[PDB]
Amino acid sequence: YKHKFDLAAANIFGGAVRVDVDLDSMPAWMSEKFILQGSFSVTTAPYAV
Amino acid sequence: TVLPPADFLHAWLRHCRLRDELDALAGDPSMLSRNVFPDMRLQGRVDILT
């Protein structure tokens, strides 16, 4: 069972890690600063048409 | 309920000029607290953008 443990460990995770995790592999919208623009002005209604 | 009837006439004469004197020292400006209306509302264009 140590022989089976050696060959099974070398079979599943034998090479390099498959999870690349690198910004070009991630989706393209992962590089922005979330621009917020506008206002919440509170004024009066106009009194003339 | 205190004064005799003779004194109450003199008190009433000075009282009647008192009422019209508080008429004079009150004024009638008006037209500034009657022409304001509850007109308040919020508007705006706020959004999250990349």
TrEMBL record, chain A:
Domain of life: Eukaryota
Protein name stated in the entry: B-box zinc finger domain-containing protein
Species whose genome carries this gene: Toxoplasma gondii (strain ATCC 50611 / Me49)
Residues of the full protein shown: 440 to 488 of 1073
TrEMBL record, chain B:
The protein, known as: Zinc finger protein
